[PDB]
Amino acid sequence: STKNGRDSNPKMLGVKVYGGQTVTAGNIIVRQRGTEFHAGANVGMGRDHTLFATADGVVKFEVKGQFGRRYVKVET
Amino acid sequence: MRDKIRLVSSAGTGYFYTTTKNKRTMPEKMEIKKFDPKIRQHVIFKEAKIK
RNA sequence: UAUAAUGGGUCAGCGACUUAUAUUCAGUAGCGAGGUUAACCGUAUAGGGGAGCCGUAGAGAAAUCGAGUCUUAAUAGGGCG
RNA sequence: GAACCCACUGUCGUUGAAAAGCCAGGGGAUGACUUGUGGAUAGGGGUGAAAGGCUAAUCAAGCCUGGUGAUAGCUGGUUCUCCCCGAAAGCUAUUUAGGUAGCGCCUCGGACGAAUACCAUAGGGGGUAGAGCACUGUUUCGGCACCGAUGCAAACUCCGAAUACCUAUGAGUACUAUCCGGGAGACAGACUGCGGGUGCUAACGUCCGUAGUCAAGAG
RNA sequence: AUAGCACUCUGCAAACACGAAAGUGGACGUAUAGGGUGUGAUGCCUGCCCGGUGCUGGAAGGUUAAUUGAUGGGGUUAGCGUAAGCGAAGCUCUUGAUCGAAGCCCCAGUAAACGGCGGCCGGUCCUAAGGUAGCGAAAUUCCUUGUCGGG
RNA sequence: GAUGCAGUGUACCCGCGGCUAGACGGAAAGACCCCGUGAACCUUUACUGCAGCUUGACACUGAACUUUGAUUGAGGUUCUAACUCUGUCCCGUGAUCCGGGACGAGGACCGUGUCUGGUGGGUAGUUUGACUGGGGCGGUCUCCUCCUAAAGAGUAACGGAGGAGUACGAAGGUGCGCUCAGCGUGGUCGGAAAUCACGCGUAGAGUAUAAAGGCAAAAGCGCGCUUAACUGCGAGACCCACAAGUCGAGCAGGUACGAAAGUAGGUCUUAGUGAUCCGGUGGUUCUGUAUGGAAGGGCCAUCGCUCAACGGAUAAAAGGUACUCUGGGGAUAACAGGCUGAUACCGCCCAAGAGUUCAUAUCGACGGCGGUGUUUGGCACCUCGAUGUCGGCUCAUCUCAUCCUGGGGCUGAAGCAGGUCCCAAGGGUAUGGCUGUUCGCCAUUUAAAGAGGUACGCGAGCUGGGUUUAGAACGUCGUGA
RNA sequence: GCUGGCGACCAUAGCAAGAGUGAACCACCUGAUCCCUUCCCGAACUCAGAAGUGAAACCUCUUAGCGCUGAUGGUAGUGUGGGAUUACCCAUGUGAGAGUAAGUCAUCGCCAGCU
RNA sequence: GGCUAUGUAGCUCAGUUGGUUAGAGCACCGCACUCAUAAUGCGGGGGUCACAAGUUCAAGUCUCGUCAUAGCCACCA
């Protein structure tokens, strides 16, 4: 007999909106377990580190700051 | 294991909350201020049996 | 499946998606914001019989309101229309 | 030890002379014996010196007629012709696994047309192949836990493609997408190439991903 | 199956069986008789265990049914009330004090009742107790065609 | 596993007597094995009923005395008139039934009706899961993390590794404030390691708990005040068969902490869970079967499941069948065939060494490469509307990896003998004791008593000792079948 | 041109060593009355100030010393079509990581004070 | 869930509704008796009466809860 054979259900994480797409307020941009990406201008952060848009506009990704973090923002 | 109890409004409206507590480390009765929607004010709620 | 998997020795005759009621959809005909009678009576497929049924208004558990209504302290927001 | 009552061995017979027999041998043969006539016990009952034996060639519950055209997610079968389109053997759940239900895939009617696809430009995230030792482990040889050379990794990463995927604009070609309704079938798959787990880098083996063919396709 | 043996039940309107009952067999019998169970002529015999389950005899302590219905709490309305509300009696819904048998729990006996007759490394532990006479590779022995003797 | 396909060989047309190697020959919708939310019968400390047996209350059921317990109860002794007699006598009557009459013996007992507790395989209806490289035994069944997973999401195996069925009124909110770990030095007990002070390189510490993704505005660590671990909502998205699940700016009310701009709808996040039905508790401007109430119901809040087989068939359920039965399957096992060749057997390569020296006359360690299709196995492609046998008998046919006989090379070959290798398939190649044996051991022979294939050749050619139906017994297992 | 504050950017920008500045600013500095503070301490936070100093610290300049950046060419991998099956070859498109040559002691904006 | 009963040293049995003002028998250790032993006799140690609270001049001894255990009974989401 074996002692293995367990696994958990999938969680479906990942980027939902890519750069250059238009969004409306409330749209979810990234699903992530930890803060792989950080919230920029017009982007909010949920209690499970989800990133969502707080304005209408166009999504942009970049690398900024002294620690070299990855940021996502919405341009109006 | 934590037991379930009710926090009943002292305003007489009958409104209540439910929560749990550890009876070993909190033998006394719970007393805490909370919002009562029937009168729309913050008042004191006090512990009672879940029943 | 040529299969060494099943069935048939051959011929002739018989042998299997029906009937009643209800309901929904599609054609077609009549009438048309209306349509239609059931049992029954009837020198009887006619003619009478309008009780009843479907449509014409929704919301709400309900009382209640009604082009609105429910939720709520709220004329805000939202759900069904 | 004859009659009579049994049935231990063997040959024959096995579409037999016979739905249990013939032949040659065998046992009991005044007894718990054999037999005629007429009676009694009836089906979850009878009877049994007991084998689940017998109860009309039928017995782990007789036969006949009714309930009755019992039920069967199982097996079989399903009858004239021509034209158009054309699948699946997947996911989820199930006292579920060869059944069924919703979704995916087919067909018909209505609405609506360029909202669709192929390709070219432009924008975007990645942690695989490869590689490496900066972390986690592991390895060899020198020097004094550290230093110098040297290897390895599905559950190591200082790095990191090709493809694939999402969005916007555009030429050309194409009956394309989408929505609302009627009817389904199907939920046993197989081999080959590529990327893999398992097995022995075995199997016309087994379990996934991806493409082609068969299934349902002749030359 | 059997003669023989043993246990147990049955005092007669017997126990037991058939039957719905009336009744019938047992038996026109009467414990030297009748029913059930096991063993199986005869010779020698038949060890230990009553902890389990069963049977037999006790106890009047715990628990417990129907029945009984003590108290307590609601509904209703005469009346009292400016009011809110209060509120007898009578009907009515509910609650359940007290009384209450056998059974079980408890205590003894019983194995020719059903059953049991050890484990571990001289001891140890645990049992209700750890196999007496007799026999033993057997209708029972895996290893196994055990070993020795005879043929 | 081919009369019928491909290549090729052979073969004029048709009977009769024989024979049984094949037509997976005929016969019986396989009885072994598995499946169906099939059947029957049997068992029991499976579930749930009932008959039977038994207990008490009330009724049939009455009269007198008495004793004893907490006004009632229990007890005892007498009596006759209900009731009993499968006791005697008389009559109906020519009658061992029955009825009436007279006695005698019992007697408010026994017995019967209704209600009620106990017992109850005697009898009846039923239940007794699925996955699964056949089934059983073992393991597993829901949730979370990593890999397999092929750089979006998703992705299976009885694939490789680990966790969960909680905790916390602060370990929640807010304002203000602070940096770990390690090492080297010095310094009472005090050391490898307690506490103190100072320097050096460094996130290697910590985050209630497993792992992963994270963590400087620290998401890590302290102090003061506190209850936003609120009520009504909610534009818009993620995920998705459904049922469910997840994120959320912003608006209104009340609030906490800040001077303030502001932050707060529990905790760094992802596990810590259970639909509907039936009921309980607190409220309520709903309903209220003539009317007014009330009972009951509705709405809002909340409580009771290891329903863990975790989308949960009932409130309530274990076994046997060799006495068996029906519907199906080569969707799935045992025999033989097939694919494969781990194992098995045979051959070769290298050669430490052994052989008085001498690797190779003969053996040959440590390692490597093949062949065959005999063994033990793996798979499940053919056959379950049947391919029906472990040995013996009879009769065979082929291979060569040769047992004898024939021809050779080398030798640690004096001769006789032997060892090893090469060529060779023409012929030949034991009888008995024991056991069902194949095999094996033993006795005695022979020039020799070879190794294999042929459905482990041959049962429509024979047998039937073994195995594997129905009877019976022993040991062992089970309460029992 | 020097000084201070706030940003853009986040190593070609950093670290390490060496040197320099007191007019102003900045820093060290004096005191603990009053505001305020230490789970003890005027060390830190805070107030009242000007006797001292540029020592420390901060800023500025020099250095390739560590670090960082980094070509060209080749190699590995790879989409499509074909040929093969230890997993490579051909046509076509694409193209790392490591290493080498080489480079680096940053570059800009707004406001205020001084020479 | 309802009703009862227990939990006293090293071991086991008492003390059971007030003034409990916890004992008895065996286990030990020491002493005495004996030529040496035992039995017996003496002495000492060995619990703080399941706990938590309540009335009280007196609480193991009574009342309340919480533990564990034993026995009977009841359980249709």
CSV table of C-alpha atoms (C1' of nucleotides) in Angstrom, one decimal, chain F residues 92-348:
chain,number,residue,atom,x,y,z
F,92,G,C1',-84.7,-37.1,28.9
F,93,U,C1',-83.2,-42.6,27.2
F,94,G,C1',-82.6,-48.6,24.3
F,95,A,C1',-76.8,-43.1,25.1
F,96,U,C1',-69.1,-43.1,28.8
F,97,C,C1',-72.1,-36.9,23.9
F,98,C,C1',-75.2,-33.0,25.8
F,99,G,C1',-79.1,-30.6,29.0
F,100,G,C1',-81.9,-30.5,33.6
F,101,G,C1',-82.3,-32.1,38.9
F,102,A,C1',-79.8,-33.8,43.8
F,103,C,C1',-75.4,-34.3,46.3
F,104,G,C1',-69.8,-33.9,47.3
F,105,A,C1',-65.2,-31.4,46.8
F,106,G,C1',-63.2,-26.6,45.9
F,107,G,C1',-64.2,-20.9,45.8
F,108,A,C1',-63.9,-15.1,45.4
F,109,C,C1',-58.9,-18.1,44.1
F,110,C,C1',-58.2,-20.4,39.3
F,111,G,C1',-59.7,-18.8,34.5
F,112,U,C1',-61.5,-15.2,30.3
F,113,G,C1',-61.9,-9.7,28.0
F,114,U,C1',-59.4,-4.7,27.4
F,115,C,C1',-54.8,-2.0,28.6
F,116,U,C1',-49.6,-2.6,30.0
F,117,G,C1',-43.9,-3.9,31.0
F,118,G,C1',-40.5,-8.3,30.1
F,119,U,C1',-39.0,-12.4,27.0
F,120,G,C1',-39.3,-14.0,22.2
F,121,G,C1',-34.5,-16.9,15.1
F,122,G,C1',-40.5,-20.2,17.1
F,123,U,C1',-42.1,-17.6,12.6
F,124,A,C1',-42.0,-13.3,8.8
F,125,G,C1',-40.1,-9.2,5.7
F,126,U,C1',-35.5,-7.3,4.6
F,127,U,C1',-30.4,-5.0,4.7
F,128,U,C1',-25.3,-6.4,4.6
F,129,G,C1',-21.1,0.5,-0.2
F,130,A,C1',-17.8,1.7,-4.1
F,131,C,C1',-12.7,2.2,-6.2
F,132,U,C1',-9.4,-2.0,-7.7
F,133,G,C1',-3.9,-4.0,-13.9
F,134,G,C1',-9.9,-10.3,-12.2
F,135,G,C1',-12.2,-10.8,-7.3
F,136,G,C1',-11.0,-11.4,-2.1
F,137,C,C1',-7.4,-9.5,2.1
F,138,G,C1',-4.8,-4.7,2.8
F,139,G,C1',-5.4,0.5,1.7
F,140,U,C1',-8.4,4.7,0.2
F,141,C,C1',-13.3,8.1,0.0
F,142,U,C1',-13.9,15.6,2.2
F,143,C,C1',-10.3,20.1,2.5
F,144,C,C1',-5.0,22.7,2.0
F,145,U,C1',0.7,23.1,0.0
F,146,C,C1',4.6,21.4,-3.6
F,147,C,C1',6.2,18.2,-8.0
F,148,U,C1',4.5,15.3,-12.3
F,149,A,C1',2.1,19.8,-15.6
F,150,A,C1',5.3,20.4,-21.7
F,151,A,C1',7.3,29.5,-19.3
F,152,G,C1',-1.5,31.9,-19.5
F,153,A,C1',-5.8,28.6,-17.1
F,154,G,C1',-6.7,23.4,-16.8
F,155,U,C1',-4.7,18.3,-16.9
F,156,A,C1',-4.6,11.3,-14.9
F,157,A,C1',-2.4,6.7,-12.3
F,158,C,C1',-3.2,1.7,-5.8
F,159,G,C1',2.5,8.3,-9.2
F,160,G,C1',6.5,11.1,-5.5
F,161,A,C1',6.4,14.2,-0.6
F,162,G,C1',3.7,16.8,3.7
F,163,G,C1',-0.5,19.0,6.5
F,164,A,C1',-6.2,20.0,8.3
F,165,G,C1',-11.5,18.7,11.1
F,166,U,C1',-8.1,24.4,15.1
F,167,A,C1',-6.5,29.0,18.0
F,168,C,C1',-7.2,34.3,19.7
F,169,G,C1',-11.3,39.9,23.5
F,170,A,C1',-6.4,40.0,22.0
F,171,A,C1',-2.7,37.1,18.9
F,172,G,C1',-8.7,42.4,16.5
F,173,G,C1',-8.6,48.5,15.5
F,174,U,C1',-5.8,52.8,15.8
F,175,G,C1',-1.8,56.6,17.1
F,176,C,C1',3.3,56.7,18.4
F,177,G,C1',7.8,54.1,18.7
F,178,C,C1',11.7,49.9,17.5
F,179,U,C1',15.1,46.2,14.4
F,180,C,C1',16.7,40.4,13.8
F,181,A,C1',20.2,36.2,13.5
F,182,G,C1',25.7,35.0,13.9
F,183,C,C1',30.5,35.9,15.3
F,184,G,C1',35.0,38.2,17.8
F,185,U,C1',36.3,40.7,22.1
F,186,G,C1',36.5,42.2,27.3
F,187,G,C1',33.5,41.3,32.3
F,188,U,C1',31.2,37.7,40.1
F,189,C,C1',29.5,32.6,40.5
F,190,G,C1',28.9,31.7,34.7
F,191,G,C1',30.7,27.2,31.5
F,192,A,C1',30.0,25.9,24.2
F,193,A,C1',25.9,28.3,25.5
F,194,A,C1',22.1,33.0,30.8
F,195,U,C1',22.9,38.6,31.7
F,196,C,C1',26.4,43.6,30.6
F,197,A,C1',29.5,46.8,27.2
F,198,C,C1',31.8,47.7,22.4
F,199,G,C1',33.1,46.5,17.2
F,200,C,C1',32.7,43.4,12.3
F,201,G,C1',30.3,41.2,7.9
F,202,U,C1',25.7,40.2,7.1
F,203,A,C1',18.8,38.9,6.3
F,204,G,C1',21.2,33.4,6.9
F,205,A,C1',15.9,35.6,12.4
F,206,G,C1',10.6,36.0,12.9
F,207,U,C1',5.8,35.7,10.9
F,208,A,C1',0.0,30.8,16.6
F,209,U,C1',0.3,26.2,12.7
F,210,A,C1',2.3,22.3,7.0
F,211,A,C1',4.3,24.1,2.4
F,212,A,C1',4.4,27.7,-1.3
F,213,G,C1',3.9,32.8,-3.0
F,214,G,C1',5.3,37.2,0.1
F,215,C,C1',7.0,40.8,4.0
F,216,A,C1',10.9,48.3,5.0
F,217,A,C1',5.1,52.5,4.7
F,218,A,C1',8.1,46.2,7.4
F,219,A,C1',2.9,41.9,6.7
F,220,G,C1',8.3,41.1,12.2
F,221,C,C1',8.5,43.6,17.6
F,222,G,C1',6.5,47.0,22.0
F,223,C,C1',3.3,50.9,24.7
F,224,G,C1',-1.6,54.2,25.6
F,225,C,C1',-6.7,54.4,24.4
F,226,U,C1',-10.4,51.2,22.6
F,227,U,C1',-14.6,47.5,20.0
F,228,A,C1',-15.1,48.7,12.5
F,229,A,C1',-14.6,40.8,15.0
F,230,C,C1',-20.5,47.3,13.1
F,231,U,C1',-26.2,48.0,10.6
F,232,G,C1',-28.3,48.9,5.4
F,233,C,C1',-26.1,48.1,1.0
F,234,G,C1',-23.1,47.9,-3.2
F,235,A,C1',-20.8,50.1,-9.6
F,236,G,C1',-17.8,46.3,-11.4
F,237,A,C1',-15.1,41.9,-12.0
F,238,C,C1',-12.7,36.5,-11.1
F,239,C,C1',-14.3,31.3,-11.0
F,240,C,C1',-18.0,28.2,-12.5
F,241,A,C1',-22.8,22.1,-15.3
F,242,C,C1',-25.9,23.4,-11.2
F,243,A,C1',-25.9,24.3,-6.2
F,244,A,C1',-22.0,27.0,-4.4
F,245,G,C1',-17.2,30.0,-3.8
F,246,U,C1',-13.8,34.8,-4.2
F,247,C,C1',-12.3,40.3,-4.6
F,248,G,C1',-14.5,45.0,-4.3
F,249,A,C1',-14.1,51.2,-5.0
F,250,G,C1',-18.1,54.0,-3.3
F,251,C,C1',-23.1,55.9,-0.6
F,252,A,C1',-26.1,56.5,4.4
F,253,G,C1',-26.2,55.8,9.8
F,254,G,C1',-23.7,55.1,14.6
F,255,U,C1',-18.4,54.6,16.4
F,256,A,C1',-12.9,54.1,17.9
F,257,C,C1',-8.1,56.0,17.5
F,258,G,C1',-5.2,60.6,15.7
F,259,A,C1',-3.7,67.9,15.9
F,260,A,C1',-4.7,66.6,11.0
F,261,A,C1',-4.9,64.7,6.0
F,262,G,C1',-6.9,59.9,7.4
F,263,U,C1',-7.2,54.3,8.9
F,264,A,C1',-10.7,50.4,10.5
F,265,G,C1',-17.0,45.8,7.5
F,266,G,C1',-11.3,40.7,12.1
F,267,U,C1',-6.1,38.0,12.1
F,268,C,C1',0.2,38.2,5.5
F,269,U,C1',-2.8,34.9,2.3
F,270,U,C1',-4.2,30.2,0.7
F,271,A,C1',-7.0,24.4,5.1
F,272,G,C1',-10.0,24.5,10.3
F,273,U,C1',-15.9,21.9,7.0
F,274,G,C1',-22.0,19.6,6.0
F,275,A,C1',-27.3,21.0,1.4
F,276,U,C1',-32.6,19.9,2.2
F,277,C,C1',-36.3,17.9,5.6
F,278,C,C1',-38.0,18.0,11.1
F,279,G,C1',-38.0,20.5,15.3
F,280,G,C1',-36.1,24.4,19.7
F,281,U,C1',-35.1,29.9,21.4
F,282,G,C1',-35.6,35.7,20.9
F,283,G,C1',-38.3,39.4,18.1
F,284,U,C1',-42.2,40.9,14.5
F,285,U,C1',-46.8,47.1,11.6
F,286,C,C1',-47.9,39.4,8.3
F,287,U,C1',-51.9,35.6,8.6
F,288,G,C1',-55.8,33.9,11.8
F,289,U,C1',-61.7,28.6,8.4
F,290,A,C1',-69.0,32.9,11.1
F,291,U,C1',-67.2,37.2,14.1
F,292,G,C1',-63.4,39.0,18.6
F,293,G,C1',-59.3,36.5,20.5
F,294,A,C1',-56.2,32.4,20.7
F,295,A,C1',-53.7,27.8,18.8
F,296,G,C1',-51.0,26.8,14.5
F,297,G,C1',-48.3,28.9,10.4
F,298,G,C1',-45.1,33.1,7.8
F,299,C,C1',-40.8,36.7,7.9
F,300,C,C1',-35.9,38.3,10.5
F,301,A,C1',-31.8,36.4,14.0
F,302,U,C1',-30.0,32.0,15.9
F,303,C,C1',-29.4,26.4,17.9
F,304,G,C1',-29.3,20.5,17.2
F,305,C,C1',-25.4,15.8,12.3
F,306,U,C1',-17.5,11.7,12.5
F,307,C,C1',-25.1,12.3,7.8
F,308,A,C1',-16.0,11.4,7.6
F,309,A,C1',-18.8,6.1,2.1
F,310,C,C1',-17.8,14.0,3.8
F,311,G,C1',-23.9,16.2,-3.3
F,312,G,C1',-25.6,13.7,2.6
F,313,A,C1',-30.8,6.3,-0.8
F,314,U,C1',-34.3,4.9,5.8
F,315,A,C1',-35.7,7.7,11.9
F,316,A,C1',-34.2,2.5,12.1
F,317,A,C1',-30.0,-3.1,9.4
F,318,A,C1',-25.0,-8.8,10.0
F,319,G,C1',-23.5,-13.5,7.7
F,320,G,C1',-23.5,-18.8,4.8
F,321,U,C1',-24.6,-21.8,0.4
F,322,A,C1',-20.2,-27.9,-2.3
F,323,C,C1',-28.3,-28.3,-1.8
F,324,U,C1',-28.6,-24.2,-5.2
F,325,C,C1',-31.2,-20.9,-9.2
F,326,U,C1',-32.1,-16.9,-13.3
F,327,G,C1',-30.2,-12.6,-16.6
F,328,G,C1',-25.6,-11.3,-18.8
F,329,G,C1',-19.6,-10.9,-20.1
F,330,G,C1',-14.0,-13.2,-23.4
F,331,A,C1',-16.2,-5.4,-21.2
F,332,U,C1',-13.0,-9.7,-16.4
F,333,A,C1',-9.9,-14.4,-13.8
F,334,A,C1',-8.3,-20.3,-13.9
F,335,C,C1',-6.3,-24.2,-19.2
F,336,A,C1',-4.1,-23.9,-24.0
F,337,G,C1',-2.6,-19.7,-28.1
F,338,G,C1',-0.5,-14.6,-28.7
F,339,C,C1',3.1,-10.0,-27.4
F,340,U,C1',7.5,-9.3,-24.1
F,341,G,C1',12.0,-11.6,-22.2
F,342,A,C1',12.8,-9.1,-15.9
F,343,U,C1',13.8,-14.5,-14.4
F,344,A,C1',15.6,-19.2,-16.7
F,345,C,C1',19.0,-21.8,-20.0
F,346,C,C1',23.1,-21.6,-23.7
F,347,G,C1',27.3,-18.7,-26.0
F,348,C,C1',31.0,-15.0,-26.2
